[model samples]
Target: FFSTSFKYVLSACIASFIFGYQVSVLNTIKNFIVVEFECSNNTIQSSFLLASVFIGAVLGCGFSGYLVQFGRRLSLLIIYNFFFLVSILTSITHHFHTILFARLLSGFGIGLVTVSVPMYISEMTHKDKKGAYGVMHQLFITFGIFVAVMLGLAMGETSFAKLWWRLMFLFPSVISLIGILALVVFFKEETPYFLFEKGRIEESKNILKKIYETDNVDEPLNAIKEAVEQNESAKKNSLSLLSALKIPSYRYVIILGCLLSGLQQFTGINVLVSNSNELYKEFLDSHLITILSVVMTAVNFLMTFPAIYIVEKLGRKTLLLWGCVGVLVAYLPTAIANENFVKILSIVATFVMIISFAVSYGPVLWIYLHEMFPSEIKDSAASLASLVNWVCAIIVVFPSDIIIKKSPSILFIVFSVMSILTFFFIFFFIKETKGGE
Candidate 1:
């Protein structure tokens, strides 16, 4: 059940879902991918396949700040959505190089969407609801991944197609299809902030009228105009990346944004989701691995509720510090368990780790990044942060074959150490912004 405001918010949420869907689907479909490419034994090939999208993502996100100038809403529609359509190219292509190229292009599209959509969502929602609104984007992402893992459960058992890996790509493609339609039908208004920024006062008022669901648009419209005018005069009003770099506070926020997003990846959340199928297949059967991945992701999905409700109450610094603590808590036990009990215990630990992140880093990190900066630099700042996220994701992901092949002691212990460092980093450098401006 979504309110009118929440419904438009869903447009951005769906973009997030598309990202999660692609991440999980690519990893879940790996066995089939190897089968199709006849590379079942090649770890190098598999690792490159996993890392390529992220490579493209980093490049896409870096350019998103410039892309948004054309129009945030328009970029979401014409550019990012177009990439979804291009993603279908991966499923249909017969050549391996073509598939990789397609993956890169699609990832670039999602990268652009990641930067544009969050700002658009933030601009559209009421300030008080920003916490819930921000968390909802990540909630949809985890949910999207869950749906993909569930599909792997059902589809992994059946011989859906000769090109089953390609068939899996269809999952994200279908999400994109729905995303395109959702934007076309449900998203009827451009963001008032964007409209006002462009100096279209009448159009801005019309959109604000819909946002407030009131006939007298002038009240909110004039308020927005006043705020925009004030911002123009506020603190040199230099929102560009170069100008932001010259300000210590803005630079600090950017550093924290990058660190928070980077650590979220190194905490091995996506790595776990992406590799669970392979890891569990070692000790357990395909059915069990499927079930375990689904259950772990389900835990992630369920835990988002706490973050949704309490994020504004507890503040980001506390939640993120505890989240890192939770990662250490989960990873410590996972690292030390003996071989006899390691498999089942590790599964449980993974669940706890995901639950911990789901409630903290998974959602609150996005909210924090969105709200930490002045509105002038929010989009550009978040884009740079997301660039860090995708880059770190590749760093961890490319070596995952080796990580999983080694002892559980090595895998979780390394992650556990990173978790503690994350804890201290937050304890020292981060600030609390509960109900953000």
Candidate 2:
């Protein structure tokens, strides 16, 4: 009924965009709350909004490994309710703690969908086409971000009006629930690899045949063989997180995954994007800065697709090295611009930072983390990697406002130094996983 994996790809892409839309909004959310709370001089307001979601998502990510063992699809069903309730609650609140709690609820949904949605894509698609399947989620994530910005733009004049940011949460919630319903009604296929892991090999193949419904099963069968080999995994015992670390490749992948995700948070990308007005208040007026921030976000969304498209061609090692180096170089002038420009060069530097992340870390981290782990341990391993990712994000997100207030471009300069160190770290320590996975 669907055209060449388009249906599967489209579903995953929509889920992913919702994740990116919320994730990308740290800058906009922070800006709004700051103006709303009269907390513009402080980073605490920004930190709370960003951290509230991270904390919620982290909690969800932590428990997801255990939950998926029961049923990946059913667990996702439970998680979707987080979206509905949080959206409604966020819109109704005026208190800080209340709104924070509501955002946290929404974060839980983001966290589960972020991990489980990708797992579904990985298990649903043929291994040779994993890049396309994987990339689709990320592509939509960018679209979600664009939509959020559009909503925020419309509501900016209303100053949230109890309806602005609330609409942001509510709208995505509606879209997400609708997506869940679609998957339930039309794409009721279990993740083949997940079933296969449970020793239900026959059921796995049957589900694959029914869902794929195109081309001979032989193609998927052969692709599966190559994928298993590429993953270099043969564990047959009970699969769990601890067992996963037994393999050096799996262990190193987790390490690299953590580092990749951690760096994204550490680079203070959100800090700059979220608090652009504070950093670059001199050069751009408040409205233009908001517009510029939204524009930068669009760039972040659009640029990542090329990397996703070329994942099979470029391989993980090349993309990682190039991305790190690019971030390092981009930060130099951006840091200078943000600091030296009386206007703080916030817009240009901010855009450069956005572009750097889009091509490199943002998409790369999501793609590599899932692909690197063995199927048996993919969920568990991803959980470990995500925990590290969230922690570093808190460290970075919470501090960007502090950095901007005390020293405008110092955060970017610091990120520049960190990026350089990260480049060397990857060069000496990281091994090629493209050939393997």
Candidate 3:
């Protein structure tokens, strides 16, 4: 009976899987990226060339805010398939300037996908299913990491050997086209909310009629009116970005969410994962390293399975608070010293911490960020919160390489502080939203 709703949930999830496949696709071949551009030969010039994607992602994320109102398909269509396609034409560009431009262009599609895809899914699902949909989306990201690691190892990680770098751009470009083609053929009903905004009352009603399959007159008519009312009410309080602070509670949550997310980047988790071989060169055998990667990523995937089940039972604040506590304890020792004992402890800690987040902030934040505002303020608040997320993401990722070297402990310590703040903030001011209509 609920299969139709689950279908939309599944479609949103599939999009996330592909999104993960595209994003982490580069991490696996980081060395190849350095070598192909010959950054080792001329460090400064090649280094900036390598940084092109980061710049691209930042600009892409910021610009996607304006595109959010256009509906998901329009956002991607206007955004970055061209950049992906153009890269193929200019694939032979060896200079920093040419490839940098292409990466920047490629970033446009990525930015839109992250923000808009989540928005699309959250709007489509009921509250009961929302957590499941969000967590499953992240499951795919874990799966992406798993696949990309295998691919990188399979290519032997030799210089110029991992040509799969190009495949990253090429594969998503092709899948996006398939999405567009399906849009043409299936013509999945646009969110009826969009039609209400377009001032096409009759068309909106007709679409709802089709969706509800009303052989009888009164029942379907009531459903259409109810759907239309949800849209009309939503328009009344659409929160503007600059004014999101009017809702004091929302501002606080976004701050905590961004801080929590940023902490993940600074702790050098991704760098450690991506650079595991280099990190543990003397300590572990090669076979053990491979096994560790598989096990860790598998844990990441398995852990997410619980998030959907727990969100309702524990509620967002409780779940996230527990997650923060896990992070604090897990990261406490690793911050002071990262030697063999600390590293081993940190590894187990990392696994638990990641699991904690998967069940808490990872899935719940999307729902919380979207719903925190009054209906009228939704778009603005969402854009600002999302912007905070990616911007902090940028802040954390670049310095992670340096930070891990200087005081690996400080990174987790900083996260511990933010989480301490979050734990207290939730206790004092936050209202539980689990059962709200």
Give me the candidate number with maximum TM-score: 1
Tell me the number of clashing residue pairs for each predicted model: 0, 4, 8
Worst 10 contiguous positions by lDDT, candidate 3: 208-217
| Tens-digit lDDT string for candidate 3 (39-121) | 34554554354355555655666666777676655654443355346446334445556766765555554555556656665
Model 2, residue 181: displacement in angstroms? 1.8
Where model 3 places Cα greater than 4 Å from the true spot, the runs are: 39-54, 76-98, 157-165, 185-187, 201-241, 245-291, 336-340, 435-437
Alpha-carbon local distance difference test for all models: 0.74, 0.66, 0.57
Query: What lDDT is obtained when candidate 1 is compared to the true structure?
Result: 0.74
- Cα error, residue 48 of model 3, in Å, equals 4.5
lDDT by residue for model 1 (1-437), tens: 22777878887777788777776776776666666566344666766666778888898888888887666667677653565677668778564677778778777876876677777777777666777788888888888788878776566653555555566676676667777777778555577777435877777777656665776866556656665665666537555575656888667878777888888888887677668777676778866777777888888888998998787777778888889888887888877774357657766786778889899988877778777775556666788988898898878866765767766568777888898899999999888775443
**Local accuracy of candidate 2 as per-residue lDDT tens digits, 1-437:** 44545576676565676676666543455555544556443455556666788887787677767777676566566665556566667666565677777778667767777677766666676655666567676677777777777666766674335556656656767866886786676456566655434656666677667655754577666556565543345444544457536767566767776776677677666565445445557556787767776777679778877877677787766777787777766677767764455335444556666776777666667767777665555667777677677667677766666666687577778888888877787788765555233
Compared with the true structure, the alpha-carbon lDDT of candidate 3 equals: 0.57
* Candidate 2 TM-score over all chains jointly: 0.85
| Candidate 2 vs 3: which has more lDDT | 2
